């Protein structure tokens, strides 16, 4: 389909797999069937038709086996929570999604006290985020913690926006996609994916920074891309392409276009702050065992970065 053909990506992109991928999708299947997360129908769909876990495979590169595990399944429960996020919109179950709601915030800060709840898509957060937070110090998860309960409040802002028919203004709609999307959720998982927390310094260095969040906004954009055709008229869902139509009066044609600008332009930057995050990686390296530690970490990381665009572009075309 030429509007979401990308030849830089193919170019210059190279796809990359964990070769854990096999063990991964099997892994899975099984963890969202012991968790009653979805019927048997839907998680063969998911594990065996789509093959999710190739998205995860594709992307945390050099993860342990038990890291990439724990994504995995992560990102299986996130699905399965924006379908539940979705049917309670499409229903109208306020008082379904407001307790929904509530106890993801408290699952999320003690996931042990939640392992076993009676709503099985709360002890699927509970068991992920267990897992989740036995590989790095308790800052790390205290910092997942706090992006995720940011996360949480933004599907909250999208429920009321969806229910009421608003759509948000374009401006209004990047910033709360960068939160519904989990940008810095995925970002924060680089790190248990190349065994090291980094400290502040190094993660908020302005190139480490914009590469992280132009991967992001590749991955979200181009999801968007992809999705807006085929999207439902039109108050009710929320889609860049969308915002444009009801805000700039675009045609579909033209938000089409407008949107895969923005594509292009996230790609070309990131080729671009992607050399100076590399080196800052190898200037990191400063002859010390932690400075070399440190440089690895982050050469890791910003490759990830790379290897979410292709994970996210060849996973939509197959």
């Given at each position: 389909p030429p509007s979401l053909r990308l030849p830089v990506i193919e170019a210059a992109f190279p796809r990359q797999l964990h070769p854990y991928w096999p063990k991964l999708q099997e892994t899975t299947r099984t963890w969202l069937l012991e968790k009653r997360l979805m019927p048997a129908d839907k998680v063969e769909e998911y594990?065996?038709?789509?093959?999710?876990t190739d998205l995860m495979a594709g992307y945390?590169?050099?993860?342990?086996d038990e890291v990439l595990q724990a994504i995995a399944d992560y990102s299986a429960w996130f699905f399965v929570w924006n379908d539940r996020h979705d049917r309670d919109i499409v229903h109208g179950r306020a008082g379904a999604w407001r307790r929904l709601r509530g106890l993801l915030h408290t699952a999320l800060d003690s996931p042990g006290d939640h392992?076993?709840?009676?709503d099985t898509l709360v002890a699927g957060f509970a068991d992920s985020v267990r897992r989740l937070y036995a590989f790095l110090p308790a800052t790390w998860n205290a910092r997942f913690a706090r992006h995720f309960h940011t996360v949480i409040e933004a599907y909250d802002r999208e429920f009321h926006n969806r229910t009421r028919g608003i759509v948000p203004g374009v401006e209004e709609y990047l910033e709360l996609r960068r939160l519904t999307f989990a940008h810095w959720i995925w970002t924060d998982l680089l790190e248990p994916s190349s065994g090291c927390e980094l400290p502040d310094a190094v993660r908020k260095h302005p190139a480490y920074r914009r590469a992280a969040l132009l991967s992001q906004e590749f991955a979200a954009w181009y999801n968007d891309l992809c999705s807006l055709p085929k999207?439902?008229?039109?108050?009710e869902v929320h889609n860049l392409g969308i915002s444009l139509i009801t805000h700039?009066?675009?045609?579909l044609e033209e938000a089409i276009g407008e949107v895969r600008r923005r594509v292009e332009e996230c790609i070309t930057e990131f080729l671009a702050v992607e050399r100076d995050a590399l080196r800052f990686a190898d200037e990191?390296?400063?002859?010390?065992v932690r400075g070399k530690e440190l440089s690895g970490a982050v050469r890791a990381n910003v490759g990830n970065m790379r290897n979410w665009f292709s994970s996210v572009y060849w996973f939509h075309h197959e």
């Open positions: 594990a065996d038709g789509l093959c999710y945390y590169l050099g993860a342990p392992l076993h709840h009676e999207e439902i008229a039109g108050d700039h009066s675009l045609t990191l390296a400063d002859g010390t």
